[PDB]
Design an enzyme around this catalytic site. Structure first.
Site, short mmCIF file in Angstrom:
data_model
loop_
_atom_site.label_atom_id
_atom_site.label_comp_id
_atom_site.label_asym_id
_atom_site.label_seq_id
_atom_site.Cartn_x
_atom_site.Cartn_y
_atom_site.Cartn_z
N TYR A 160 0.80 -1.20 0.00
CA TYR A 160 0.00 0.00 0.00
C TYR A 160 0.84 1.26 0.00
CZ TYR A 160 1.11 0.23 5.06
OH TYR A 160 1.74 0.25 6.28
N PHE B 294 -5.64 5.72 0.63
CA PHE B 294 -4.69 4.61 0.47
C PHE B 294 -4.78 3.89 -0.87
CE2 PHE B 294 -4.77 3.97 5.30
CZ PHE B 294 -3.95 5.05 5.45
N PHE C 182 2.48 10.04 2.79
CA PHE C 182 3.02 9.97 4.10
C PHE C 182 3.39 8.55 4.43
CE2 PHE C 182 -1.51 9.54 4.68
CZ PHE C 182 -1.56 8.44 5.54
N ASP C 183 3.21 7.65 3.49
CA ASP C 183 3.62 6.30 3.75
C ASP C 183 3.66 5.54 2.47
OD1 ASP C 183 4.16 3.85 4.82
OD2 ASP C 183 2.25 3.62 5.89
N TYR D 151 -6.92 8.73 12.79
CA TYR D 151 -6.34 9.44 13.94
C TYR D 151 -7.21 10.59 14.39
CZ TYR D 151 -2.19 6.78 12.90
OH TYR D 151 -1.31 5.76 12.61
N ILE E 296 -6.15 1.75 12.36
CA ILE E 296 -7.21 2.76 12.32
C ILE E 296 -8.54 2.10 11.93
CG2 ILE E 296 -5.70 4.70 11.92
CD1 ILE E 296 -6.16 4.46 9.09
#
EC number: 5.2.1.8
Lengths: 469, 123, 107, 207, 318
Positions: free
Chosen positions: C26, C99, C36-37, C82, C56
């Site tokens: 992912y 995502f 961010f990832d 979050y 989450i």
């Protein structure tokens, strides 16, 4: 090649550092081979140990070998760095010659290296390693949320069984100094106290550490102006031998802390230290006690009124005047000044306050010991009044029931008219009935046979008539 | 926990690509490298300096017969002493000590060394 | 609330179930679309037990939609993520996450 | 207020030296204020400059620019979607020579095709389009991404820019309308990674 | 005990049986730093000097520096001509550092020591001893030049507060010790080395410090040290005289105090030893004569007390 190749300086730094890893490893491997040499040597030592020196020559064969192109090209290349340049960057150079020195005396470097080296049992390795990681945590905290992690370390270290098992390691670690540095750093926050009790318990375990922290104690006291003091007494009491060594300045600073306190509990703690500062394992030393006694009077300059108003009921200043008596009690050419204690009988009638007393146990525990260290059979008959609390003895069956077992000692202490003596002796025969901790009660039986040695005798034979019952 | 944030925000792999080219400008590179250390390597090492300084040792069977001298070499993998392993949980953005590639990385850097030496000697 | 959308359809059958350790690739990006990832950034697949509440909440809901071999875009609401706290140092408060998930295998 | 100062002043490096100075003391540090720096920075994205990476993008066109209605065919021979960290690029769409000059070395928010107001585009999940590199997500009649199968195909009516992509004989709904005819239009097929596509033209399939 | 014991083996091995002979290395090391404008050793020197010049209020222990100070510390008619060749071999060993300007820096560190009593200070002073021995006046003059060009003020103050404090055997210490003065010895020997070769310009400059706006007479203070040590001597008398025989450790330790004190007297002797009429004026204003009396006293009785036994005269000799 690479090292041989010229490059500008700033690489030189990193490179020499890369080299420091090497030398460091050599030192490591050397320590290690030394240890294998140890384990190999101990065998025949235990053989002769159970056989109950000539062999030693063989180790000589391996002893010289221990001393040492590799290190040489390093030294030389350093010299080349220093030759063709007039280098600056003091930091660089510092490293340079650091390394160089690491090259030219690996012997002595080994020597300074040794102390921190330490063998450990293979079974115990796991806990040790974890302790090292937690120690590395605290060392991570060397550079500082603030108030919790450290305590995590604390708890984690107390959990360890290695802390008993290898005290020499714990001294070797020097961690005490670290955590103490943390303390100071804070002192320039609530968590601090458990941490302090930690360092205290750490100090407790051994003299070869109690020494060490003993060396820190003035420094700790500058801090104790604000409970570190506990740590100090823990660092002092168990070992007379450095209790002898303590500075006067410790003590002047201690009394200095006794200044505007009286406008207290901190003052009664200052007293508690100096209470622990002398009496030690046995009899208080004439050394320290004298130097204490010289200064005692200086900072105070109807106190029995403060005493009895307190007995009747804030609870701080009363236990200052109560601890102070025990303080003057445990201390003792010396025959010159030891008489001045009694002038500054300074209590005297205050002894009799103990009779009025019946919070409470501090008061008996202070004044009884004040009395035994400085002070007439009939005068004992005058004293016949600790028997009040012997009247209170049956009330246990509260802040009292559990108190009897320390009063079990306090009754035994003053081993050193007549029908009144039949009565307080019959109170003691009641304590025989309590006999009808417990080994301290056998010491009370010793107080009984001593009461027979002490001493109209016939009224004692009447208390021995109720006792015949 | 901050560092993880940065991993979110600068990406280890990005820096791994940043290891390669000369075309990457100097100082900026210096930052990417120092950060690559910083984000990860720095803590383990931070502790490790002291730990390795300690020189404490056990009595495992190797240690009692580790020996030493030829009638000399340094970077042997025996030794041990003690010294704790550094843990590293990866920065998984889902609900401390961020992970990085290990051997891959040493291979990279070592490749950079060879690249540094074969042209650095020629100057 | 949550609005996950499938990308590449998979076997279309074996959705993740209780206790299964999902193995997925992912990447994580903001409402801004800023990353961010990325699982690919570490190259290593990420593995998580379902129902473990280790994730989450929107990941717990949406990934369950996914089939084996499937790729899916997750439009998880911040309230399921979050949320208002945000993710300290990472995700700003009240930010929907986006995502590009790709399940490899249920475990 | 300081970060806000930096935002007031745009790109001044000095402020940053100030910040790193905030971060750390003589050796020790206030970790908290730093984490506040990060939450105030790193989530905020926009104030500090920030970076990432793409894979190289390469557009393809038939030689002839158009200025009647036209139609062309683009079979998808190959796709390798997830090689490297990026999802593989393979956008396809119409374009013109002034508002689209694809230089691979960067420009625009992280890409090359679909970025221009003058260019019109298609690809990936849910079909749809990209203008300004905006992902308007017009859902396909059903569905699929780009894999080595679909004969994706396109048409354009003269004058009116009623572009509408088609997924292997299935049109991707209503799409583009009303655009300038400033200079000749031409077909485009951007790609990334190890990918191949065939033109059944000179060989027609779906017209 | 097994592994418990093994550490005991470590520490046992650590001891004198492994405190090895191989200490010829330093000198060839020193040559190695000076092979080869400026020399590498000199680079070391200016390094440390740089280390010194910087303000730290206190100072870094800097083990490295004390270490090299130790390295450089390594430099030591039969009774004459052979003594001559050795003397000049030592002059080379001293000149070799003298080229470096080392003294400067040492004096600088020492100036930086201020109120410190650190071990590294000992290494420095010992280094100063390493260089100044044999009465090397040239070193004293280049030092002096550095003392006038810089007019440091604080150097002499540094010596002064130290001298004001240093260390003394006292009394109670022993009393407790039943069940560093050497540094002082070394320090004031160092000071004697400042004055050997009889550089009265330097001695007066120590007396009055004219280049500086401030003024200090160091020597007054060493006299004072002699006073206090004397007073230790005296109380050592008023204790021990009543017991006749002295034990062992007190004997040797007190003897070592006599080495110290002797060294002090020696240092004074150098202070006055030339035709320094003004220093003698200073001593005219010195309390020195009591300082003599008390030794006269304690020795006038203690030597008799030590004459009781031949075991005691190995001390009485001192």
């Amino acid at each position: 090649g690479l090292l041989q190749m010229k490059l500008p300086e700033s690489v030189k730094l990193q490179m020499c550092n890369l080299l420091e890893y090497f030398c460091d490893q050599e030192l490591q491997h050397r320590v290690e081979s030394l240890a294998a040499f140890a384990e190999r040597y101990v065998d025949k030592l235990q053989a002769n140990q159970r056989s109950r020196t000539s062999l030693s020559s063989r180790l000589r064969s391996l002893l010289e070998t221990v001393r040492l192109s590799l290190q040489e090209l390093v030294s030389h290349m350093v010299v080349r760095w220093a030759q063709e340049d007039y280098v600056q960057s003091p930091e660089l150079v510092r490293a340079m010659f650091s390394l160089l020195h690491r090259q030219y005396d690996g012997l002595g470097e080994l020597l300074r290296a040794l102390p921190r080296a330490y063998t450990i049992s293979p079974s115990s390795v796991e806990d040790t390693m974890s302790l090292l990681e937690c120690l590395g945590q605290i060392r991570s905290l060397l550079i500082v949320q603030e108030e919790n992690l450290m305590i995590q370390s604390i708890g984690n270290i107390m959990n360890n069984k290695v802390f008993y098992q290898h005290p020499n390691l714990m001294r070797a670690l020097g961690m005490h100094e670290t955590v103490m540095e943390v303390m100071v750093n804070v002192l320039g926050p609530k968590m601090v106290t458990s941490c302090c009790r930690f360092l205290c318990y750490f100090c407790r375990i051994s003299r070869q550490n109690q020494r060490s922290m003993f060396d820190h104690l003035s420094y700790l006291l500058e801090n104790s102006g604000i409970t570190p003091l506990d740590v100090a007494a823990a660092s002092v009491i168990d070992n007379n031998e450095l209790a002898l060594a303590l500075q006067e300045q410790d003590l002047e600073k201690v009394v200095s802390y006794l200044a505007g306190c009286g406008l207290p509990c901190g003052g009664e703690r200052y007293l508690d230290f100096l209470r622990f500062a002398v009496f030690v394992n046995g009899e208080s030393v004439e050394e320290n006690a004298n130097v204490v006694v010289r200064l005692l009077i200086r900072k105070p300059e109807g106190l029995l009124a403060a005493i009895e108003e307190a007995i009747r009921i804030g609870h701080a200043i009363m236990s200052f005047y109560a601890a102070l008596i025990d303080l003057l009690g445990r201390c003792a050419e010396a025959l010159r000044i030891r008489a001045i204690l009694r002038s500054l009988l300074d209590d005297l009638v205050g002894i009799i306050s103990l009779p009025l007393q019946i919070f409470v146990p501090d008061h008996k525990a202070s004044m009884v010991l004040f009395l035994d260290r400085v002070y007439n059979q009939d005068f004992l008959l005058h004293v016949l009044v600790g028997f009040l609390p012997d009247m209170r003895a049956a009330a246990s069956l509260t802040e009292m029931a559990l108190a009897l077992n320390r009063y079990l000692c306090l009754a035994v202490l003053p081993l050193i008219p007549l029908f009144a003596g039949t009565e307080h002796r019959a109170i003691m025969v009641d304590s025989m009935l309590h006999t009808v901790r417990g080994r301290s009660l056998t010491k009370a039986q010793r107080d009984v046979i001593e009461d027979c040695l002490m001493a109209r005798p016939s009224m004692l034979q009447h208390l021995l008539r109720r006792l015949v019952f | 926990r901050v560092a993880h944030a940065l991993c979110s925000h600068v990406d280890q792999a990005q820096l791994l690509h940043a290891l390669e080219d000369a075309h990457l400008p100097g100082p900026l590179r210096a930052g990417y490298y120092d950060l690559l250390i910083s984000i990860h390597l720095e803590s383990a090492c931070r502790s490790r300096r002291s730990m390795l300084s300690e020189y404490i040792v056990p009595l495992t069977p190797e240690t009692r017969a580790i020996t030493l001298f030829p009638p000399g070499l340094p970077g042997v993998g025996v030794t041990t002493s003690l010294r704790p392993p550094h843990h590293f949980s990866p920065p998984c953005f889902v609900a401390l000590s961020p992970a990085i590639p290990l051997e891959a990385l040493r291979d990279k850097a070592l490749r950079m060394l060879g690249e540094a030496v074969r042209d650095g000697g020629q100057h | 609330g949550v609005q996950v959308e499938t990308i590449s359809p998979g076997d279309g059958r074996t959705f993740p179930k209780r206790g299964q350790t999902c193995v997925v690739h992912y990447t994580g990006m903001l409402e801004d679309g800023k990353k961010f990832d990325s699982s690919r950034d570490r190259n290593k697949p990420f593995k998580f037990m379902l129902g473990k509440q280790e994730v989450i909440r929107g990941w717990e809901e949406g990934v369950a939609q996914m089939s084996v071999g499937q790729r899916a875009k997750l439009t998880i609401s911040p309230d399921y993520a979050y949320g208002a706290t945000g993710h300290p140092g990472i995700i700003p408060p009240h930010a929907t996450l986006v995502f590009d998930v790709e399940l490899l295998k249920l475990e | 207020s300081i970060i806000s100062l930096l935002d007031k002043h745009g790109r001044n490096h000095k402020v940053l030296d100030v910040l790193c100075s905030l971060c750390v003391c003589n050796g020790v540090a206030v970790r908290s204020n730093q984490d506040l720096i990060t939450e105030n920075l790193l989530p905020g994205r926009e104030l500090l400059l920030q970076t990432n990476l793409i894979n190289y993008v390469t557009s393809i066109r038939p030689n002839i620019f158009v200025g009647g209605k036209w139609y062309f065919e683009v079979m998808v021979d190959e796709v390798v979607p997830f090689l490297t960290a990026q999802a593989t690029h393979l956008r396809v769409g119409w374009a013109l020579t002034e508002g689209y000059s694809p230089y691979p070395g960067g420009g625009e928010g992280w890409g090359g095709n679909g970025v221009g107001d003058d260019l019109y585009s298609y690809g990936f999940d849910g079909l749809h389009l990209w203008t300004g590199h905006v992902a308007r997500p017009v859902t396909s009649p059903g569905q699929h991404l780009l894999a080595p199968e679909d004969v994706v195909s396109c048409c354009l009516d003269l004058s009116v820019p009623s572009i509408s992509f088609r997924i292997n004989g299935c049109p991707v709904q209503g799409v583009f309308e009303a655009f300038n005819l400033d200079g000749l239009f031409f077909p485009v097929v951007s790609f990334s990674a190890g990918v191949k596509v065939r033109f059944l033209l000179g060989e027609f399939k779906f017209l | 005990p097994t592994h418990r014991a093994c550490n005991m083996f470590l520490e046992s091995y650590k001891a004198a049986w492994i405190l090895t002979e191989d200490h010829s290395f330093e000198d060839r090391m020193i040559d190695d730093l000076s092979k080869a404008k400026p020399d590498p050793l000199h680079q070391l020197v200016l390094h440390f000097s740089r280390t010194a010049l910087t303000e730290k209020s206190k100072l870094d222990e800097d083990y490295l520096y004390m270490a090299y100070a130790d390295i450089m510390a390594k430099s030591c008619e039969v009774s004459f001509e052979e003594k001559e060749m050795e003397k000049q071999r030592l002059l080379y060993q001293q000149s070799r550092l003298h080229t470096r300007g080392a003294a400067e820096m040492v004096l600088q560190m020492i100036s930086a020591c201020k109120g410190e009593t650190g071990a590294m200070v000992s290494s420095t002073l010992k280094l100063g001893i390493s260089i100044l021995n044999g009465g090397n006046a040239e070193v004293q003059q280049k030092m002096l030049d550095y003392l006038k060009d810089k007019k440091e003020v604080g150097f002499f103050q540094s010596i002064q507060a130290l001298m004001q404090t240093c260390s003394v055997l006292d009394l109670n210490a022993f009393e407790r010790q039943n069940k560093d003065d050497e540094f002082t010895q070394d320090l004031f020997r160092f000071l004697q080395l400042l004055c050997e070769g009889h550089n009265n310009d330097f001695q007066n400059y120590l007396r009055t410090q004219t280049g500086n706006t401030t003024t200090i007479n160091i020597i007054i203070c060493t006299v004072d040290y002699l006073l206090r040590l004397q007073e230790s001597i005296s109380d050592f008398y008023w204790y021990y005289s009543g017991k006749d025989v002295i034990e062992e450790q007190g004997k040797r330790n007190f003897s070592k105090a006599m080495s110290v004190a002797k060294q002090v007297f020696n240092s004074l002797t150098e202070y006055i030893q030339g035709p320094c009429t003004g220093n003698q004026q200073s001593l005219a204003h010195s309390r020195l004569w009591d300082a003599v009396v008390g030794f006269l006293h304690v020795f006038a009785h203690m030597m008799m007390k030590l004459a009781q036994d031949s075991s005691q005269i190995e001390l009485l000799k001192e």
